[PDB]
Design an enzyme around this catalytic site. Sequence first.
Site, PDB file in Angstrom:
ATOM      1  N   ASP G  43      39.093  43.169  49.649  1.00  0.00           N
ATOM      2  CA  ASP G  43      39.807  43.790  48.535  1.00  0.00           C
ATOM      3  C   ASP G  43      39.635  45.229  48.761  1.00  0.00           C
ATOM      4  OD1 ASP G  43      40.990  44.392  46.254  1.00  0.00           O
ATOM      5  OD2 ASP G  43      39.777  43.076  44.976  1.00  0.00           O
TER       6      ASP G  43
HETATM    7  C1  LIG Z   1      28.381  56.250  35.414  1.00  0.00           C
HETATM    8  C2  LIG Z   1      29.194  56.918  34.395  1.00  0.00           C
HETATM    9  C3  LIG Z   1      29.762  56.050  33.285  1.00  0.00           C
HETATM   10  C4  LIG Z   1      31.172  55.057  34.168  1.00  0.00           C
HETATM   11  C5  LIG Z   1      31.959  54.345  33.102  1.00  0.00           C
HETATM   12  C6  LIG Z   1      33.346  54.186  33.606  1.00  0.00           C
HETATM   13  C7  LIG Z   1      34.181  52.597  32.999  1.00  0.00           C
HETATM   14  C8  LIG Z   1      33.877  51.676  33.691  1.00  0.00           C
HETATM   15  C9  LIG Z   1      34.783  50.577  33.420  1.00  0.00           C
HETATM   16  C10 LIG Z   1      36.401  50.554  33.713  1.00  0.00           C
HETATM   17  C11 LIG Z   1      37.233  49.376  33.001  1.00  0.00           C
HETATM   18  C12 LIG Z   1      38.298  49.282  34.136  1.00  0.00           C
HETATM   19  O1  LIG Z   1      38.167  48.654  35.373  1.00  0.00           O
HETATM   20  S1  LIG Z   1      39.883  49.555  33.401  1.00  0.00           S
HETATM   21  C13 LIG Z   1      41.006  48.541  34.113  1.00  0.00           C
HETATM   22  C14 LIG Z   1      42.533  49.069  34.429  1.00  0.00           C
HETATM   23  N1  LIG Z   1      43.371  48.210  34.625  1.00  0.00           N
HETATM   24  C15 LIG Z   1      43.552  47.535  35.776  1.00  0.00           C
HETATM   25  O2  LIG Z   1      42.670  47.861  36.714  1.00  0.00           O
HETATM   26  C16 LIG Z   1      44.711  46.537  36.166  1.00  0.00           C
HETATM   27  C17 LIG Z   1      45.356  46.312  37.658  1.00  0.00           C
HETATM   28  N2  LIG Z   1      44.171  46.644  38.559  1.00  0.00           N
HETATM   29  C18 LIG Z   1      44.425  47.295  39.791  1.00  0.00           C
HETATM   30  O3  LIG Z   1      45.296  47.490  40.081  1.00  0.00           O
HETATM   31  C19 LIG Z   1      43.414  47.704  40.774  1.00  0.00           C
HETATM   32  O4  LIG Z   1      43.857  48.654  41.876  1.00  0.00           O
HETATM   33  C20 LIG Z   1      42.679  46.553  41.551  1.00  0.00           C
HETATM   34  C21 LIG Z   1      43.670  45.083  41.631  1.00  0.00           C
HETATM   35  C22 LIG Z   1      41.278  46.176  40.935  1.00  0.00           C
HETATM   36  C23 LIG Z   1      42.366  46.900  43.047  1.00  0.00           C
HETATM   37  O5  LIG Z   1      43.515  46.703  43.789  1.00  0.00           O
HETATM   38  P1  LIG Z   1      43.623  47.013  45.259  1.00  0.00           P
HETATM   39  O6  LIG Z   1      43.986  45.534  45.894  1.00  0.00           O
HETATM   40  O7  LIG Z   1      44.452  48.204  45.896  1.00  0.00           O
HETATM   41  O8  LIG Z   1      42.204  47.379  45.758  1.00  0.00           O
END
Ligand SMILES: CCCCCCCCCCCC(=O)SCCNC(=O)CCNC(=O)[C@H](O)C(C)(C)COP(=O)(O)O
Lengths: 459, 165, 70, 84, 175, 124, 88, 128, 52, 55, 63, 178
Positions: G43
């Site tokens: 991935d």
């Molecule tokens: C330490 C400081 C604090 C940190 C906190 C930050 C917050 C963390 C929580 C975040 C929550 C989320 O993920 S918010 C979620 C946002 N929505 C999505 O991710 C939908 C589609 N996802 C994608 O397209 C990605 O690229 C993916 C398929 C995963 C990879 O694809 P690849 O095949 O190209 O690797």
Amino acid sequence: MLKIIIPTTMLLPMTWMSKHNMIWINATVHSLLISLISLSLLNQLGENSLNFSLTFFSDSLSAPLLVLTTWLLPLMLMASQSHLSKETTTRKKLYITMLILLQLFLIMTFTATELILFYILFEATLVPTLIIITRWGNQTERLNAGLYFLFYTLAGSLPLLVALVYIQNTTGSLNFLIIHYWSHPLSNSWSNIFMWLACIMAFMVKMPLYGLHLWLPKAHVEAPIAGSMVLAAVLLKLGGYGMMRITTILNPLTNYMAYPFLMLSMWGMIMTSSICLRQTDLKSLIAYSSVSHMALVIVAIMIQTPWSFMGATALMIAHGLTSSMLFCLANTNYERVHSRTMILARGLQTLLPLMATWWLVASLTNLALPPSINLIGELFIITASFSWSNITIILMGMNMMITALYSLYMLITTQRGKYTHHINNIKPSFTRENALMALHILPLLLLTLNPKMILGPLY
Amino acid sequence: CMHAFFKAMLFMCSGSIIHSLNDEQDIRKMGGLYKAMPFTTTALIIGSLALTGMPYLTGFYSKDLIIEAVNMSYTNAWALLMTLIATSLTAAYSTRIIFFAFLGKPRFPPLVLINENNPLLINSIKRLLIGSIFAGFIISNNIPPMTVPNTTMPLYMKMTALIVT
Amino acid sequence: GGVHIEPRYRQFPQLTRSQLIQAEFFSATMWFWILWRFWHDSDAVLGHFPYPDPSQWTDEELGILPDDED
Amino acid sequence: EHGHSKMELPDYKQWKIEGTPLETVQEKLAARGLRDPWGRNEAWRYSGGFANNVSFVGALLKGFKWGFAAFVVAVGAEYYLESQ
Amino acid sequence: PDSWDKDVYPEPPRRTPAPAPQTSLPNPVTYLTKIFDLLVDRPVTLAREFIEQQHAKNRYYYYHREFRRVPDITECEEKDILCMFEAEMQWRRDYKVDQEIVNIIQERLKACQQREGESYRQNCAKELEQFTQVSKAFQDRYSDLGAHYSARKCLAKQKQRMLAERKAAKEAAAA
Amino acid sequence: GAHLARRYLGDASKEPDPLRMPTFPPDYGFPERKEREMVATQQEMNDAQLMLQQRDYCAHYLIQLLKCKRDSFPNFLACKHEQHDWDYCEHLDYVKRMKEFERERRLLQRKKRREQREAEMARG
Amino acid sequence: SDAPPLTLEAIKDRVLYVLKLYDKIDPEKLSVNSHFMKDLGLDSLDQVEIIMAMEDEFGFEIPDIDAEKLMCPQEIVDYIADKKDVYE
Amino acid sequence: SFPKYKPSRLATLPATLDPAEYDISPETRKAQAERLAIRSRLKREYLLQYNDPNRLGVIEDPALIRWTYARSANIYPNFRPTPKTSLLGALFGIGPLFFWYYVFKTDRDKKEKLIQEGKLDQTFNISY
Amino acid sequence: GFVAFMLFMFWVGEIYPSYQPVGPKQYPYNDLYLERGGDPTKEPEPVVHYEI
Amino acid sequence: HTGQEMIISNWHWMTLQTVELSLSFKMDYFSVMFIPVALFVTWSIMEFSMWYMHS
Amino acid sequence: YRHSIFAVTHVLIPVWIIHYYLKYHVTAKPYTVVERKPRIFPGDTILETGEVIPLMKEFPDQH
Amino acid sequence: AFSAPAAYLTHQQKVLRLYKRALRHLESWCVHRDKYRYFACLMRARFDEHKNEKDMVKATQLLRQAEEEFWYGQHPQPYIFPESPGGTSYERYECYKVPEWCLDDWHPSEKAMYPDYFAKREQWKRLRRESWEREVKQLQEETPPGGPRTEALPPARKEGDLPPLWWHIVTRPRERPM
Ligand SMILES: CCCCCCCCCCCC(=O)SCCNC(=O)CCNC(=O)[C@H](O)C(C)(C)COP(=O)(O)O
Ligand SMILES: CCCCCCCCCCCCCCCCC[C@@H](O)O[C@H](CO[C@H](O)CCCCCCCCCCCCCCC)COP(=O)(O)OCC[N+](C)(C)C
Ligand SMILES: CCCCCCCC/C=C\CCCCCCCC(=O)O[C@H](COC(=O)CCCCCCC/C=C/CCCCCCCC)COP(=O)(O)OCCN
């Protein structure tokens, strides 16, 4: 006193009858010889003066200025040897003629037993400078600059002449010795107030005083290297010399007529210094630094104490040398880069280390680092002003800080950092420029060994 | 005089650690160095112990007298409070330094290049080591008296610096 | 002017007996000095002159009359 | 004179999570349903000379034993020569 | 040293204690100063003796210039420029002499404080009193004259001070 | 500390103020009032040029300490006895000052008690 | 410094070494030219973790834009070599 | 929810916290594309001039010349007398002078009055 | 807030100083009259000290 | 050993009327105590810098 | 040998020059070198005069 | 740095960047390796819970609150590599970097030393002189009307051809010249 004047006059026929490829060599050699001869004026007495004749006399205030003026000319010759390479022989000889005329006028100005002769020569020094600025200048603004450098000065100096003749119709003589011995107090009157203003503004317009200083940046930027040299080194000190000489008759009015101007200087030395912090030009920054130093000199002269006078004399000498060195360094950078902008050429310490050393030494000397004579004059003026009033130190303290800042700013923007990538015409520094910087800097460190030579007649 | 010795030694030890760790200054990437480099370790422990004024060390002969004179003087109470809290925080940051850069598992990159076998480093460190150990006693006992001593003290006020440390 | 030591790549770096014995000697010297100074000079930390109790002083040496004369 | 001895990278199969706190991390992660894909990568931090640790008190008391022995020897000699 | 006058620059007898060694252990100070003497003082002394004999082989004298006394500013006409010139030069020479006198007293004071050491405040009282008196006289004579000082301004200051003192004394007598 | 707490949280007039101390005459308590003895005269204490803050009643022991320190110079731990004597004299001076403090405190106590008793008797 | 002049063989050895302790990748199928998303079926988040592992291994951090398009061990080795100016 | 971050003049808004970046419209994408096109054209020009073997001088930057000219020489021709300009010029050019004059005059008058009264203790005041 | 609290507590501690239950230090010769300043032609009021 | 203290006012730089500026050195307790400590620290630091700044 | 030549060219000649200049030029002018007066305690004898400082008051001693 | 930038960042790129930043700041917060491993695995599990989400509006609503949570707990003193733009040795060796054309100003006495190096330099200069003449026309032919749309350069397509604008990319001084 003629043993100095006559060789300066003979500098001209030798220059004009020289070969087409030997003008610079003969001019430099004989100018250095004349400087060696003029060194003998440094032997002064604690008594009245060295009254050579009815026309010329010397004092421990005039001797250092004369020595500096005579020593300046060879340095201007070396500086101007470069950008006048593609010039016709006649025009180069005319340039050297203008420089020699300027030196002769300054030499005859600094002796000046009589005040009207002093005025005549002090105004005669205006012509060669204007011709040099407006003829051998690079940019299109030079003409305008020349106009400024002219009219400001004249606007100050025309009333003074009237005042002078008026004194001769009342006192009966303008000889400085008779004036000193037969001095009488000035009664508090409107007529005396305007006489004081006429006597003072002529020299404050050429310091320059803050608010009357708009001509200096233009004249310094648009002039060639020798013009900036002679403007920053000697021409600014004419007002200081004139002010010290002229006052002996303005008392006790100066006790309260000094108030409008001291403030204008005490705040002004701040403002111009702050102006140096936000600048996109090297020449403008050096010019504003010169303005600030001359403002401190103005405060020193107007305080009217012996320590004030000693500090002012030392500061004028040191500032002349330092500003000449700074202008020379800026011109050396410009002749390679052709832009005269601080931010364009950067990281030149990696490419030219010895020139970076010269830059560092010049910046430190301008920064008033002890035990240099710059700091000697600065500290004497500061102590005298503290005796004048305990609050003044505040402003003075501020100025010191600001000074250092912009000085090192000049050193950091140009020498430090990463070199400009697209500039590939930075040739190694020649022997001529290095010799120019060495001959600039060695006299300062030598003079710091014997300060009593440049502390004035009140030492 | 005492601070010269022990602070210079502490800085040299820190510089040796930084140089041996491929120019890395963060303590978050320094792990087990109590065994990985013995001489820097013992020198830094000695420097930290002298800085925190362990008795009969270079820091003791000055800092303990400082605390004694400040406590037993006509001053502002806030001044003594701040001085004591500052001594406690000095112990705290010395503890922080030792704990993070030596006790923990090594966190530096895999290519280990740690070495101490250079005569210049060892000699320069050991000179200030013997200084930080003995200069306090020799200098304190070899100078003429210049102040009135605080001969009598309460038991709790005599031990206050050690207590806070 | 030291000796040749090679990198280990995730293994404990080589140590010579010289630096180990030098570190051990210096630590032992420091601790011996501390113990010796404590033994020979114990009054520097614990104190040599007992602190008197002002409440324990009898009123005779303290110059007070029985609340009647003065 | 530089370090050109052709150092060899050891085999990659020695590094095992067994016997390290990473085992406890793995147990705690599997109690939730996860796995650490980089657990073996850092194993060299607990394998060789890094396995044994030292506490703060032991670190401060680095040369207490030998210093104490020297102190006892010195005080015994002092007692034996003073009582003469 | 005979190079200066002991009366202008007085010094106490400079009593020094005698060495009283209490232990049999030898101090390094006397050994170090003995080797310093042997290794430095003797060659320098020999070189100085050679240079002094060379100087004595060729001896010549120089003299202190004596200046005559001329009428001061109090007996000058209004515009009589020559006699004002002479009086002004005499006054400037007297001003220099006064400055050097104040410098001499300041040197005495500086030397005494250093020599006295810990008990300097009580001991240097004699030097401090002399400096206070001389400084008061100098400040009365020359203070607040200005950058363009002259004998006429000093005479005017003295005249005004004398008028003030005369008026104050007359008021006190006629109180 | 406790006196600081007693003064800043209790009654201020109950306990003395160190700045203006002492507020009571020396002969208020007893008329014996033996005087303090000074051993080192002015001349030798000046010649030794100790310090202005070391010119106290313990100056003779300081003189002995300096004599030993100058005489047996290289063996800097030789004369330890005079150090102890000077420390003892300083301790005696300090406990004398503490006795003065306690005397002033209880004198103020009894004076305030006398004033309160007189006021109560006048009221009754 | 006393830092040995690492070479291309060292870079490849360390990169493959780091990739072998990645328990998600089978050491047998792993090759210097094996693609990440297709040959090993990883991935994008695993690719970012691989980039961070390389960053920790080599002591320098790759910019995100350059790191996001490193899909083979061979090109990772080439990028690191071009960064550190490795001859052989 | 977490405590919010309030931007100021000297502490601007992070790129990741900007509301605008999250909401995207096609016009925004086209604007970004044409911004990048202009930047790419300028970079192509600079790289063409920079790598030329026959060039042995300074590549003149019109932007730098414009910046210096606007900062230095273009100020006055665009200046217009306005109540804001008049008020600020009067204040910053007149107020400090009068303030310092008042302060120094008051101090010197007090000092001279004390001098005339004789209670200033100018003992040892020789150099001035 | 940190700076203001520090300044206020410094002023408060100035109002409420710290000292020991001790009297003033006593100096032998008229409170060291001759050695501190001098004036040997004044014969000041003698200060004698209390031995307890 | 004794408590030796000295000033060496060797070179007379200049004189401003009644003020005399000369090259003067004070050799009190502070000077003779801070001289060796600074020299020792600088010696150790330079020996360490020979190794630290070799490249 | 390098140590000896360094010690003879870097220490001995400067100290020779300095001692000569101090002893025969600096000292020749008054108050150039002013030394702290040596401490005098009861009981020392003076080399120049030979007199002995008397002892103190013979005050009480104990502990 | 080597790769040419794009006109914008897609959602996938922003998600990857926030993942990298969060992991780096978590490593900065969690000093020790086992604790960092545990919390990084936990964060990864919390991160791929919404991996399979489809609609764009909710996905854009996420990565926002996440952006804010990152900013609240961003460890104001994070770990930075020494050579990184915030490291203690970011530009330590930038004063030792000297341009190559400086060697053209060397005196013949200096050029007498290192003859072979200057012969190789002359060969490189000749190669550049011919190469630039080829590459200028190659780039002119390649570019679309209205100029370039990205700052990405084409490779060489002939046999003796070289990539356009290569002289100041190939002739970088060094990483640590001295
Ligand atoms: C330490 C400081 C604090 C940190 C906190 C930050 C917050 C963390 C929580 C975040 C929550 C989320 O993920 S918010 C979620 C946002 N929505 C999505 O991710 C939908 C589609 N996802 C994608 O397209 C990605 O690229 C993916 C398929 C995963 C990879 O694809 P690849 O095949 O190209 O690797
Ligand atoms: C622009 C950059 C700077 C350039 C240089 C500027 C410096 C020039 C400033 C001139 C100095 C001050 C002028 C006169 C000073 C005398 C003091 C007087 O002004 O104060 C009061 C005077 O009161 C009023 O000022 C009366 C005059 C009112 C008219 C003055 C105009 C005010 C603003 C003008 C500024 C213009 C400057 C630029 C000219 C082009 C004192 O009241 P009084 O006790 O009764 O008079 C005492 C004098 N006696 C004894 C001879 C009688
Ligand atoms: C860079 C710009 C600076 C320009 C110079 C500004 C200074 C202006 C100085 C005043 C100008 C005239 C000076 C007068 C010459 C001295 C002679 C004198 O003062 O004699 C007076 C004469 O005084 C005057 O006549 C002066 C009147 C002024 C006339 C010209 C006005 C010019 C403008 C005045 C205002 C500007 C002053 C401040 C300028 C600030 C800078 C802008 C007495 O004459 P009597 O009749 O014989 O005696 C009376 C009893 N029987």
